[PDB]
């Protein structure tokens, strides 16, 4: 098993993470100067073309070899712990894959990177012609996200529903396993991920007339059914009573964009102070949030530069 | 500008979240008369008009990108609505063409 | 529908609720434009101001009249653009109404 070698491999990698002062420089640059800067970094090391499709691809391929190769390098008890983190990036691939089989559209225009399910699992799944067979091919790597899929697929074959019940059931699955793999660092974070999900499920489905109890799943810290119901009526006075959590910063805010920005920045923060717990999954935890967030800012800074958008429209979203 | 706001900021975070966004949202406008065509007889010959209002949803796609997904879905409205103005003036342009030409004639 | 625009901005009009078939393939998007309106099996056809056909006669002679509109101005990009107010006003005054 064991994170002893694996943590060590990641510590060398934390050396080539992009510090805050790069994005600071990049805003001052035009697209031509941005491109010269980008090539110094490790995302730059996969670059294959000046234009936009190529920037999206260099970023993605950097994430595929430095982050998406982690579950293979461990096994067992190590592997389950690392796997839960990786699983969110796999769910994104799965939801798109499930949707290409079902609505008959090509394999293309989806997210592919390795994680827990390999590239070949997604190709064999795609080519499967019965949803049940599609499901056994997915169940081969082993993970809680299969077991979550399997139960939802028994109730339904409707696209929109499978998507929602899979996500709900999946975070519930994740939580139980994670609580049983211990460590304070992971527990604090898990709580925030669920709390953030809860808020966020409420925002995405806002005003659809639905049940507010459906947007609250266990794992919480301070949020409950009533806050959800008020929130659903359109009242944001609930967020103004929400303190003692690091979402203290959501108070007095009522725009969906500022609210959701806020949750992603909070989750970033928890993970960045998990490096005072680098033992076990703590360090990897911090490493994945930072590679993800970094990749996102280079894509936003590249878009902002190419189309000559307003600076303040993106300067605020590239810092927490 | 507030349509495009999100669009252009969801291109390199899309091309694999394209799938997700189109799913939660209300499916495509019909290609055969998705718009509402109105007929109207008026001087300057019988010119037909129309208003671009159709369903497309807003702030209701589940899963995906936290901010951008929902903000892109909402943006569809700012196509629709905006397009009605040009929907009436470019058809008015063809009417006032007839008049002007017959007048000078 | 179809919106006929720049490749990257064409992208955002292919999303559900809307139906686009854009992209540039020419400087006035003739390659696409012509073929597409020829059928008139789209509820609306729209051509932006980042292309816009300098010979409008070309289109009319091919579609052969249409009871649905064509070439609705959309900006076609974002860079804080709002010159499409005064531009469209003069577009009107040059070909019809009073002079200057």
From Swiss-Prot, chain A:
Keywords: ATP synthesis, Hydrogen ion transport, Ion transport, Transport. The keyword Ion transport applies. GO terms for cellular component: proton-transporting V-type ATPase, V0 domain. Gene3D superfamilies: ATP synthase (C/AC39) subunit, domain 3, V-type ATP synthase subunit C domain. The keyword Transport applies. Produces ATP from ADP in the presence of a proton gradient across the membrane. HAMAP family: ATP_synth_C_arch (MF_00314). Belongs to the V-ATPase V0D/AC39 subunit family. This is V-type ATP synthase subunit C. It comes from Thermus thermophilus (strain ATCC 27634 / DSM 579 / HB8).
From Swiss-Prot, chain B:
This is V-type ATP synthase subunit D. Belongs to the V-ATPase D subunit family. Produces ATP from ADP in the presence of a proton gradient across the membrane.
UniProtKB/Swiss-Prot annotation, chain C:
Pfam families: ATP-synt_F (PF01990). The gene is atpF. HAMAP family: ATP_synth_F_arch. This is V-type ATP synthase subunit F. Produces ATP from ADP in the presence of a proton gradient across the membrane. Keywords: ATP synthesis, Hydrogen ion transport, Ion transport, Transport. It comes from Thermus thermophilus (strain ATCC 27634 / DSM 579 / HB8). GO terms for biological process: proton motive force-driven plasma membrane ATP synthesis. Belongs to the V-ATPase F subunit family. InterPro entries: ATPase_V1-cplx_f_g_su, ATPase_V1-cplx_fsu_bac/arc, ATPase_V1_fsu_sf.
């Amino acid at each position: 098993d064991d994170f002893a070698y694996l943590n060590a491999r990641v510590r060398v990698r934390r050396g080539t993470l992009l510090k805050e002062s790069f994005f600071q420089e990049a805003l001052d640059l035009s697209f031509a100067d941005f491109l010269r800067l980008l090539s110094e970094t490790v995302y730059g090391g996969e670059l294959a073309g000046q234009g936009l499709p190529d920037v999206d691809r260099a970023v993605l391929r950097t994430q595929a070899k430095l982050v998406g190769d982690l579950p293979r390098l461990v096994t067992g008890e190590a592997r389950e712990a690392v796997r839960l983190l990786l699983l969110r990036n796999d769910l994104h691939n799965l939801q798109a894959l499930l949707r290409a089989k079902a609505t008959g559209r090509p394999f293309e225009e989806v997210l592919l990177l390795p994680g827990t399910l390999r590239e070949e699992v997604w190709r064999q799944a795609y080519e499967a012609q019965d949803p049940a067979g599609m499901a056994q091919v997915l169940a081969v790597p082993g993970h809680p996200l299969a077991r979550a899929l399997r139960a939802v697929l028994r109730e339904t074959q409707d696209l929109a529903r499978v998507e929602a019940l899979l996500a709900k059931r999946f975070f519930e699955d994740v939580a139980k396993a994670a609580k049983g793999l211990d460590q304070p660092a992971l527990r604090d974070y898990l709580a925030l991920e669920v709390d953030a999900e809860n808020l966020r499920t409420a925002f995405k489905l806002q005003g659809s007339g639905l049940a507010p109890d459906a947007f609250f799943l266990k794992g919480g810290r301070f949020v409950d059914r009533v806050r959800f119901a008020r929130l659903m009526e359109g009242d944001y006075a609930v967020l103004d009573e929400l303190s003692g959590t690091p979402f203290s910063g959501l108070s007095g805010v009522r725009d969906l964009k500022a609210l959701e920005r806020g949750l992603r920045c909070v989750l970033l923060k928890e993970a960045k102070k998990g490096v005072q717990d680098p033992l076990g999954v703590g360090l990897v935890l911090a490493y994945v949030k930072e590679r993800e967030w970094e990749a996102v800012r280079l894509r936003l800074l590249a878009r902002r530069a190419y189309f000559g958008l307003p600076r303040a429209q993106v300067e605020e979203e590239v810092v927490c | 500008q507030a349509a495009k706001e999100a669009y252009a900021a969801l291109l390199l975070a899309q091309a694999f979240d394209g799938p997700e966004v189109v799913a939660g949202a209300a499916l495509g406008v019909p290609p055969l008369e998705g718009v509402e065509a109105e007929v109207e007889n008026v001087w300057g010959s019988k010119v037909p008009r129309l208003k671009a209002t159709f369903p497309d949803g807003a702030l209701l796609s589940p899963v995906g990108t936290p901010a951008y997904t929902l903000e892109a879905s909402r943006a569809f409205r700012r196509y629709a609505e905006a397009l009605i103005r040009v929907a009436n003036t470019e058809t008015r342009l063809k009417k006032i063409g007839e008049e002007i030409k017959k007048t000078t004639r | 529908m179809a919106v006929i625009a720049d490749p990257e901005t064409a992208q955002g009009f292919r999303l559900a609720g809307l139906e686009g078939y854009g992209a540039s393939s020419a400087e006035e998007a003739q390659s696409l434009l012509e073929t597409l309106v020829e059928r008139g099996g789209y509820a609306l056809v729209a051509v932006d101001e980042a292309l816009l056909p300098d010979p409008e006669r070309a289109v009319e002679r091919l579609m052969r009249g249409r009871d649905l509109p064509v070439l609705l101005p959309i900006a076609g990009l974002k860079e804080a653009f709002q010159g499409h107010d005064v531009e469209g006003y003069m577009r009107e005054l040059v070909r019809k109404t009073i002079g200057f």
